Amino acid sequence: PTELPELLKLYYRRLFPYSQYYRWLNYGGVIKNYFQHREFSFTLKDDIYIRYQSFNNQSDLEKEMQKMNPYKIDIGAVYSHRPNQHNTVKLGAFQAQEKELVFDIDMTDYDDVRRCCSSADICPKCWTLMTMAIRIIDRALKEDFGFKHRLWVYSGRRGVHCWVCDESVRKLSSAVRSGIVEYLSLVKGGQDVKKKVHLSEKIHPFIRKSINIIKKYFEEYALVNQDILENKESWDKILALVPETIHDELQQSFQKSHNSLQRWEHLKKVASRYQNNIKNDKYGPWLEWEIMLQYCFPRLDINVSKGINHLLKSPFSVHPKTGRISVPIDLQKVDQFDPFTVPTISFICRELDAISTRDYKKTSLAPYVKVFEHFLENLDKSRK
Ligand SMILES: Nc1ncnc2c1ncn2[C@@H]1O[C@H](COP(=O)(O)OP(=O)(O)OP(=O)(O)O)[C@@H](O)[C@@H]1O
Numbered sequence: 001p002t003e004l005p006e007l008l009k010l011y012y013r014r015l016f017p018y019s020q021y022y023r024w025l026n027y028g029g030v031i032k033n034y035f036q037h038r039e040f041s042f043t044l045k046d047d048i049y050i051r052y053q054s055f056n057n058q059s060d061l062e063k064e065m066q067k068m069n070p071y072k073i074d075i076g077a078v079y080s081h082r083p084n085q086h087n088t089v090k091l092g093a094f095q096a097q098e099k100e101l102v103f104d105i106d107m108t109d110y111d112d113v114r115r116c117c118s119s120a121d122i123c124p125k126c127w128t129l130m131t132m133a134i135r136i137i138d139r140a141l142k143e144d145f146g147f148k149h150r151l152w153v154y155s156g157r158r159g160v161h162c163w164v165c166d167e168s169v170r171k172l173s174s175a176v177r178s179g180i181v182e183y184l185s186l187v188k189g190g191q192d193v194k195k196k197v198h199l200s201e202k203i204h205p206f207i208r209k210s211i212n213i214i215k216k217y218f219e220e221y222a223l224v225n226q227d228i229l230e231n232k233e234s235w236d237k238i239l240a241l242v243p244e245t246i247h248d249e250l251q252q253s254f255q256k257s258h259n260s261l262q263r264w265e266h267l268k269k270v271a272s273r274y275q276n277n278i279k280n281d282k283y284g285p286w287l288e289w290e291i292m293l294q295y296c297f298p299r300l301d302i303n304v305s306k307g308i309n310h311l312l313k314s315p316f317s318v319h320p321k322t323g324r325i326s327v328p329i330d331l332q333k334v335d336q337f338d339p340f341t342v343p344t345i346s347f348i349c350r351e352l353d354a355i356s357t358r359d360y361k362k363t364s365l366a367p368y369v370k371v372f373e374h375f376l377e378n379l380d381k382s383r384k
């Protein structure tokens with residue numbers, strides 16, 4: 001904590017990838033005042049922050065960042081005027097106009113289905129949730145919606161962010177954004193609700209494909225690492241998600257079995273023989289899927305995404321509570337992403353001057369900048 005000022009000064013002077021950052025938020029300079037009308041919000045010492053900050057170009061941003069040395073950096077929306085001049089504008093005229101479509105996934109939202117961590121804690125046993133969350137959401141954005149430019153970022157403590165930056169996506173309204181969220185959402189209800197997933201008879205392709213993703217991980221994550229069917233205290237939470245008329249049949253089988261794998265197979269067979277609708281003789285795995293979805297499907301903080309003017313932490317900003325750097329995630333190596341090897345600001349400041357040019361390529365931050373650059377090159381191609 002007390003070390004942050006001098007470390008931040010070195011970080012913002014020799015390590016922050018300014019050229020790549022400007023390339024991103026300038027979007028080729030094709031539109032006028034697109035970067036000049038962008039809100040940045042800097043958090044300083046003592047939880048003090050300033051909103052409606054904007055800059056004229058890359059140089060002006062470098063000088064202001066090296067002058068303020070903010071603990072945290074938030075990106076806002078592109079406004080109708082210079083945010084830093086918003087007080088000169090007549091009331092009602094200053095309006096948010098465009099912003100990337102953003103998603104924020106917090107591991108805390110899985111506390112009800114996590115047996116290893118709680119609150120802002122994370123560990124390798126439960127990080128697979130984020131692995132599934134990236135694969136499920138990113139597929140839907142890419143394949144179902146046609147979005148081509150998606151930057152996934154480690155938030156620095158307990159989850160991940162996604163920046164969808166296609167120029168028409170940046171123009172979407174709040175209504176369409178919330179509609180996209182609704183399309184993507186399946187786990188609904190707070191701690192009040194016991195069963196948070198309910199499927200229809202007809203399965204929409206989105207649901208099928210997400211389930212097929214979860215099936216690739218469910219054994220190692222849920223039945224081994226989490227051991228969701230370890231004892232009665234654990235498998236009673238799953239029995240709370242199925243009808244009561246099959247509790248007894250499962251209770252016995254679980255006690256006769258010895259581990260979660262066997263008990264899960266019993267659950268699948270029993271659930272597939274349960275008769276939902278007495279009119280027809282139709283049976284299926286709806287319950288099986290509802291359980292898997294309730295334990296593995298992305299839980300999206302809905303309000304982050306519907307608001308055009310919502311602030312989100314900038315990539316390559318530091319998390320002031322962990323010292324970690326918000327780094328992009330290599331989509332080609334999503335399963336191998338290890339949040340516990342993400343460098344802290346102290347670590348890369350050490351690597352810079354550690355004896356065995358003086359920039360980020362001399363540290364462990366480089367490969368993450370390469371991920372960011374591949375993202376930027378795809379954007380450049382889309383413009384040509
Ligand atoms: N006080 C605040 N005012 C305005 N925006 C705020 C804010 N505190 C946070 N935000 C914005 O919400 C994003 C998500 O919050 P959180 O999930 O707690 O932080 P994070 O950046 O995702 O990092 P983690 O702790 O989740 O890993 C913030 O990024 C943004 O500032």
Ligand SMILES: [Mn+2]
Nearest residue numbers: 104106155159
């Ligand atoms: Mn978050």
Ligand SMILES: [Zn+2]
Nearest residue numbers: 116117123126
């Ligand atoms: Zn954990």
